[PDB]
Structure 1
Amino acid sequence: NVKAYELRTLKKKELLDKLDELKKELSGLRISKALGNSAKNSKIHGVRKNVARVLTVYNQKRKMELRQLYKNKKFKPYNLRKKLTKNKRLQLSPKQKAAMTLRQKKKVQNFPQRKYLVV
């Protein structure tokens, strides 16, 4: 029934091995079901779940490795890029939006909107 916290520590090969075993077990169960049996029909669900868990663990490991590989370097795969609503991606970064023509900037610096308490 193997829960994830055990599996994080395992190396990828070991994980793969585990997964194959689980798959084999599942296949066996399926075969049994197909044949006139209902002894361990309900065992299958758990096995399936276990398999799923294993897959998840492995997938996340793989993703982490990928991320490590493509750390920085301007361009990246579009997977490892910031998946985010298209419009937002298109949109100008806040900094870009801010960026002021030099005269305007100067003006801002000189005559900023002051605080002035009226009495």
Structure 2
Amino acid sequence: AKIKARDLRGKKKEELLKQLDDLKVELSQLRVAKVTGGAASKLSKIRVVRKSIARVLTVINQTQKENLRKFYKGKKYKPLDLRPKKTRAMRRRLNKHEENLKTKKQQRKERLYPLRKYAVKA
């Protein structure tokens, strides 16, 4: 009767929030049972509900993040959390375009005097 991540992804925001609410009221009831003695079966269910709550929340967060990435795809300016986080040093270096572009003087030399493949006899 447990909840999985795969079957949660087809659901829409309304019932995912509904699913999360039902787990929260159940966890609070389990926490009440823990204080008033309860039973070992109810104590062991505390972890199960807690991971179920984490399971629902991560699907909501992943679905939201995926939609936001789709919404901002192709736009010039993106939120910082949607931009790549390689490394502070790596985000400051020249991109591929300005790393390989050359001056007209440089490409004239390469066109006129390209490196030749050659061999020498003994």
Kindly report which structure 2 residues correspond to 1:1-119, keeping only aligned pairs within 5 A, or say none.
1-39=2-40, 40-119=42-121
Amino acid at match of 2:63: K
Query: Separation in 1 of the partners of 2:17 and 2:3?
Result: 14
Measured after TM superposition, the shift of residue 118 of structure 1 is: 2.1
Aligned to 1:89, the other structure's residue is in SS state helix
Following superposition, the deviation at residue 105 of structure 1 comes to: 0.9
Letter in 1 for 2:15: E
Q: What's the C-alpha RMSD, in Å, of the aligned pairs?
A: 1.1
**Unmatched runs of 5 consecutive residues or more in structure 1:** none
Tell me, which stretches of 5 or more residues in structure 2 are unaligned?
A: none
What TM-score does the superposition give when structure 1 sets the normalisation length? 0.94
Alpha-carbon distance in structure 1 between the residues aligned to 2:108 and 2:98? 17
Give the whole-Å Cα distance in 2 for the aligned partners of 1:2 and 1:93: 44
Q: Offset of 1:96 from its aligned partner?
A: 1.0
Name the CA distance, whole Å, in 2 between partners of 1:112 and 1:93. 26
Write the distance in 2 (CA, Å) between the matches of 1:118 and 1:12: 73
Aligned-pair CA distance for 1:94: 2.9
Provide the secondary structure at the position in 2 that maps to 1:4: coil
Q: Which moved further from structure 2: 103-112 or 43-52?
A: 103-112
1:62 & 1:95 partners in 2: Cα distance?
A: 32
4+ long deviations beyond 6 Å:
none
> 49-58 or 34-43: which moved more?
34-43
Query: How many equivalent pairs are there?
Result: 119
Separation in 2, partners of 1:95, 1:116: 32
